[PDB]
């Protein structure tokens, strides 16, 4: 029941993966970057491409999911 800003890293990964199965391959990257609820809402495509090494496709899909809970 807990909401976004208070999400743990695993809760963020569950959100991404349960909504878009094609992004599950990037799960460990989210663990590596310690993307918890606060971090998720603070993400953007530039940061994902430059710092997490994500390609544009995946970054845009993730941003689409982030926007829904921000």
């Amino acid at each position: 029941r807990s909401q976004p800003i208070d999400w743990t890293i695993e809760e963020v990964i569950q959100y991404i993966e349960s909504n878009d199965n094609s992004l599950a391959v990037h799960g460990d990257l989210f663990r590596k970057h310690e993307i918890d609820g606060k971090a998720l809402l603070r993400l953007n495509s530039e940061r994902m491409m430059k710092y997490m090494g994500l390609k544009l496709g995946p970054a845009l899909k993730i941003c689409n999911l982030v926007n829904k809970v921000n």
Binding site: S45, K55, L56, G57, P58, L60, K61, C63, N64
Partner: protein, 68 residues
């Protein structure tokens, strides 16, 4: 099938076969653009992130919207 169901390969074929004087397939393959991503891809991304010229970018975005 809906664009939302297109794989990265489906997108690659769509792009490479887009009638025009250039070929942007490599640009798309490098960015792992599947159907879902293609629907989210707009001029700002093609131009400011992928370095495409605005004319070509607008036409691609327009083709996608027409197909959908």
């Amino acid at each position: 099938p809906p664009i939302s169901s297109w794989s990265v390969d489906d997108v690659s074929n769509f792009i490479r076969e887009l009638p025009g004087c250039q070929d942007y397939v490599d640009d798309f393959i490098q960015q792992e653009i599947d159907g879902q991503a293609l629907l989210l891809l707009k001029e700002k991304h093609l131009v400011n992130a992928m370095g495409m010229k605005l004319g070509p970018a607008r036409k691609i975005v327009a083709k996608v919207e027409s197909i959908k």
